[PDB]
Design a protein around this nucleic acid. Structure first.
Length: 124
RNA sequence: AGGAGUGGAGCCUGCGGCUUAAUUUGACCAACACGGGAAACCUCACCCGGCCCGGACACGGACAGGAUUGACAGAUUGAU
């Protein structure tokens, strides 16, 4: 389905991915996700803490599974997944970046997720 | 009017006093083998050491190379 824009498509992933609990936030879980074959999607972003990890994530995509997408601004991904799920209209206690997240088999496979993502993925 | 006893002896058990780190505590005919209280631990209120949080909920803060949990071996320790 979708309108075939990369950003609002990846949002439709994220909706059902939240329910699926596919989100592997933080470096330890990110590493474990891509060292595992259960991952199917990766998105990275600009320098959060080091310019080293942005390199390392590409290094892991090389060795294990190429799937990478880059959408910059840590604050974007930080907003996109709150405490466990995106939480409130507000929420000033956190909005801190997740810096990169990995999602498992586009969350759920039930509807539009497969087509919107597959259109981009073989090209990228 | 009588019968059998208690008070004497030894022991059991409760109470006072005295001691003691602590000898937990209520009760003075209508308290005193009473608290169905014959306590090894447990009980446990007491004393002496060590550990644990099982401080809900609210508001603010922290914070995804991260809030936070637990632990092998050595030292330490009654203590693995």
């Amino acid at each position: 389905g979708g309108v075939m824009d990369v950003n609002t498509a990846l949002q439709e992933v994220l909706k059902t991915a939240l329910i699926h609990d596919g989100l592997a936030r933080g470096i330890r879980e990110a590493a474990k996700a891509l060292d595992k074959r259960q991952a199917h999607l990766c998105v990275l972003a600009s320098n959060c803490d080091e310019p080293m990890y942005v390199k390392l994530v590409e290094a892991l995509c090389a060795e294990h599974q190429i799937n990478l997408i880059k959408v910059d601004d840590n604050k974007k991904l930080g907003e996109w997944v709150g405490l466990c799920k995106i939480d409130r209209e507000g929420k000033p206690r956190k909005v801190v970046g997740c810096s990169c997240v990995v999602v498992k088999d586009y969350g759920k496979e039930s509807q539009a997720k497969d087509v919107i993502e597959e259109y981009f993925k073989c090209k990228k």
